[PDB]
Amino acid sequence: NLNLFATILTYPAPASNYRGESEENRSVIQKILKDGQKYAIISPESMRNALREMLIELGQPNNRTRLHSEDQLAVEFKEYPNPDKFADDFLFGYMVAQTNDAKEMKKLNRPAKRDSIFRCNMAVAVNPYKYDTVFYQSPLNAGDSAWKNSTSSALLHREVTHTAFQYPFALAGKDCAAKPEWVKALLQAIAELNGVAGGHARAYYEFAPRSVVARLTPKLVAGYQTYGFDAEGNWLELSRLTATDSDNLDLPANEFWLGGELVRKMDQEQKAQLEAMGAHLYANPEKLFADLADSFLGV
Amino acid sequence: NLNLFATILTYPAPASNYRGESEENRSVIQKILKDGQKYAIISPESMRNALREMLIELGQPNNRTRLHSEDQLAVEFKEYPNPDKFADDFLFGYMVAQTNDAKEMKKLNRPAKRDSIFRCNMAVAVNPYKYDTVFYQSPLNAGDSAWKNSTSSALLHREVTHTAFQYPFALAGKDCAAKPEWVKALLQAIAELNGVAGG
Amino acid sequence: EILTLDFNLAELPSAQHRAGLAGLILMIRELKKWPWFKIRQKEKDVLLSIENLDQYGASIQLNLEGLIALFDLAYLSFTEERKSKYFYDVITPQGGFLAGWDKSDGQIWLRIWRDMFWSIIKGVPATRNPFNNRCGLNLNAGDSFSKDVESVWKSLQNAEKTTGQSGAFYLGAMAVNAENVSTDDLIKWQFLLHFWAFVAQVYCPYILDKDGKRNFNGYVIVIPDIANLEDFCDILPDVLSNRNSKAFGFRPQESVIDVPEQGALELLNLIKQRIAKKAGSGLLSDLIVGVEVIHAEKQGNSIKLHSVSYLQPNEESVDDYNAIKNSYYCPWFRRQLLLNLVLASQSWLKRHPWYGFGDLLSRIPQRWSYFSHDARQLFTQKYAEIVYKIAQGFVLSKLSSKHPKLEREYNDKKEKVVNEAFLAIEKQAFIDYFVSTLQDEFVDFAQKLFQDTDEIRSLTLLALSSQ
Amino acid sequence: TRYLRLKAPFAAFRPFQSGSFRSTTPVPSFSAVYGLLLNLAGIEQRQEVEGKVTLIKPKAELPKLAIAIGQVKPSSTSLINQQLHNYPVGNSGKEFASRTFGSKYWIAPVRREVLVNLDLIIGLQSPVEFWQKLDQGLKGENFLFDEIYPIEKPDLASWYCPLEPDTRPNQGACRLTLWIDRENNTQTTIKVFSPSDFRLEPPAKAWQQLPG
DNA sequence: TCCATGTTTATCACC
């Protein structure tokens, strides 16, 4: 009867995602004026696509594929999603057509028009942008080929940065008990996130989960705002650990277990006893997600 | 079925990747801002070119080479003699136009786009540098013979630094088509990487 | 028969709805100032009378013949011949009352308005189907068209009824980006939207390239939110008749703007000057409540929008126009601080940090001096005259001990070190000699030099002007 | 009677009938506020129907309440241009007419925009039963809301109020909607709203009574 | 309910 939600972090590495809308001879990335600075943003859609790709990669059946069409990219290989089983991974069976299900009496099921599961937010960077640049050559394909050569060869610029990406999870819904196996597989796939942004093959970036820590009581989201972290030095502490210490009996530390895999490195014992007696295990995020899923599916 | 990936480094030595595009009086190499310091950068395109060159060296069938006989940068064998039947690392290169060998549909049924099996990332240094270090000098002209006629009498200087640096790379395992003798040659050639620089 | 209509400005949800009322009022007034209109009134008994004209409400009475005459005036078109630079003719609308007020050199302002009308609002062939057929008619010969008027007149009988919108007007009531559902509207509102384009102001934007060519692309549309209908219709006849006649190539000088906000703010400057000239009008807010800015561009068969804005016209930006006229004339990158001014944005122009984006673009192409030497000085700190005297004394002492093309050498010498100062984003050596060449301000040197940022990029700029 | 505060890092309130290019308003619409309040109450919508339209909401029975809106700090906005789910507006043809399983097949990206930060002090005058139901929902058994806690009496801020045809406004919102169903109707009459910057409690004119 | 089309203009203001 609870809806636990988490927050992930990623190891620093040069950025790869490019957001298009190229101006002049450079491809740029959208920025937000958080405090008058620049930051990197990855839209939730690409992450949803990566999750669906992982679910189709692990053998879970589905009815939606986007293939490399010769003309322009499109999504196909779908049918009537009358059963939510074996279709749509219990999420977003969108439909707008009027001639649907022979006017719906033969379906005898909800059209899945707006059933939304696994709501998710959009990732933000931790460091500003300082106007970097890497050169680009793109020589003409040939001087004699039958295939065209773009009539010229032009050199261009790029920009990259090294930055982590904090991320709220916002998993909700006590009704996802029909297929516990599907939920466990989805959680494992999230634990095995990689190649989330379809940026490009070279200079690739991957979302390696690290210090993925958040829990809450069977209430709605509150408490720690799922943000407010430093530049990878020490992030969860000044965010919420002082509040947890000051509210060891006010905010429930029994269910809200410890935070940060870094506890494996400094101040392991002090955090081990004088914080709380809850399941503060942190060895691999895989087993953490496994036993958290077991507890969540228990009640 | 068995993915793999690694990270490698090298021995310390003076830097080599001299971009040298800043201005007439300087040769500035590419830099990155890491934790308030500046570090050297080598783009993955150089390593891709070096791997292509070594695949040329080992007597492996190829579909691309340079000519070095044109006013500007040019590559000829990439698109001139090839129907893109089988690339070097199965890249199966692409280019967009109104038509391309009848949209490369009828003659050779292949996807318009490419595959990009191999993956790589940027190479970053391990310790920073401290501004200009080395000096230089240029001759006046051809002198008695009138063929160069630069009339420069210039005097400039470039930039060098001493640093060893490392980079990672990856490779998927589910790609096992025509694998037994193609990819292992590439993996063997990963051990050499001699001529990957800008001079 | 006789048809009477009444309208109010307290229920219109869109600014264009209000603009169309003033547009049609101006069209009716223009009709009242034409002898052939009176001839038609005498012959065919044309009825067109404005009953109520006040601050808020409006009334009108008209017959079929009056509607036909209004359609003939508004939708009058002619044919123009264009040569490629094998002949081709282009149908162009007359423009209505615009020809009656444009006395500029060659009516170049009219040319800009006509191009936008055919190009974006009328991209759909519907303008051409109606426009081409109408073209070449002679009013003096009694030529008229009434096939389309009959449908509109029949529709106007049930003004309370509903009918779908179209892309000729404001777009969006088509697919709606979600669900196959139409829009809600009423008939007489759609009819009023047939004349909002005339009141609109047109500006031509452009994008800088590496060579500095004014690459014009798209258009900028300004839509005013009329507060007092009675007062608004009086000032405009002189506002549009006092436009600057300066011409630059195929476009007027004022027609060239960088950012969309330039066109809207420039309109406020023009109105207030005419307010100072046309008595009976006070503040800008008493005439205009809001200003709409639209950026549009047509590519192939589709029209792409870039920005839609509507924000708070004010009167404290008058000095800004004069601040940029005497400043932006020489360079081309001073527009950045102009964009800077337009809870923590009141006096943000004091810092005016226009160094980041401006310097990166102009690196390679526009590098081809001391005009911009002092520009980066203020950005380096984020004190000036003292360094100037120090540098002057050193050179004077050097030549004293030793006792027409120096400008070109001066430009090259500083460029060699200004460029390297840009990349720094030894420095205590040359100043060490200069100070040696030379006390409360002397104490302040220690506190203004020990900062790392000041050491990195501040102290190494002013001294370069010497040698 | 009693009111409450809320905050959130990101938000988006798209005006309806935006067309190709999407926009937003600095203050959420009244209808969105009512939807949020109903959702937090734990009471489902009166309509349980599926089809072309899914906002068939007769006003026969619905709890009554008065709603005010506050605003403590101005917030900027940014824009992102990634992708959009297009609805076909042209005869089209081909593949779309072949599969037809909730197709929406044609895809073309244009634009959209979002906010940078949100923090509001919402005012409510409601019967006791509705407030008790809200308390039970919050305490009992799309990046829009982050956390909620009632700090009504302190933390004063500005408010909004409709303006009559006099003087001039400042920093006012463009459009606002009271009640709407996505079918043929009259929508809403009052559109223009303006804020007033003063510390004490909002005037009686600031409170607006929703017909629903 | 379903059949249809279109573009044509070059360039300028500082010490």
Numbering used by the authors:
A (entry chain B): 3 to 301
B (entry chain C): 3 to 201
C (entry chain J): 7 to 91, 117 to 373, 379 to 404, 410 to 423, 438 to 458, 469 to 490, 495 to 507, 513 to 541
D (entry chain A): 12 to 152, 167 to 237
Question: Please, what does the article write about this entry?
Answer:
Type I CRISPR-Cas systems employ multi-subunit effector Cascade and helicase-nuclease Cas3 to target and degrade foreign nucleic acids, representing the most abundant RNA-guided adaptive immune systems in prokaryotes. Here, we present two cryo-EM structures of the Synechocystis sp. PCC 6714 (Syn) type I-B Cascade, revealing the molecular mechanisms that underlie RNA-directed Cascade assembly, target DNA recognition, and local conformational changes of the effector complex upon R-loop formation. The stoichiometry of SynCascade was Cas8b1-Cas7b7-Cas5b1-Cas6b1-Cas11b3.
The final 3D reconstruction reached an overall resolution higher than 3.6 Å, which was sufficient to identify the direction of the main chain and the clear side chains. The target strand (TS) is embedded within the complex and hybridized with the crRNA, representing the full R-loop formed state. In our full R-loop state structure, we modeled 6 bp of PAM-proximal dsDNA and 19 nt of NTS ssDNA. Out of these, 9 nt of NTS ssDNA were directly located downstream of PAM, while the other 10 nt constituted the PAM-distal region stabilized by the small subunits were modeled using “A”. Positively charged residues (R88, R159, K244, R245 and R282) within the Cas8b NTD made sequence-independent contacts with the negatively charged NTS backbone. In addition to electrostatic contacts, we identified aromatic residues (Y119 and F281) of Cas8b NTD that participated in the stacking interactions with NTS bases, which stabilizing the single-stranded region of the NTS seed. Comparative analysis of the overall structure of Cas8b in the two different states showed that its CTD extended in the full R-loop structure, with an RMSD of 6.7 Å. Comparison of the “belly” in the two structures reveals a pivoting motion of the extended Cas8b CTD, accompanied by a correlated motion and rotation of the three Cas11b subunits reflected by an RMSD of 3.15 Å.
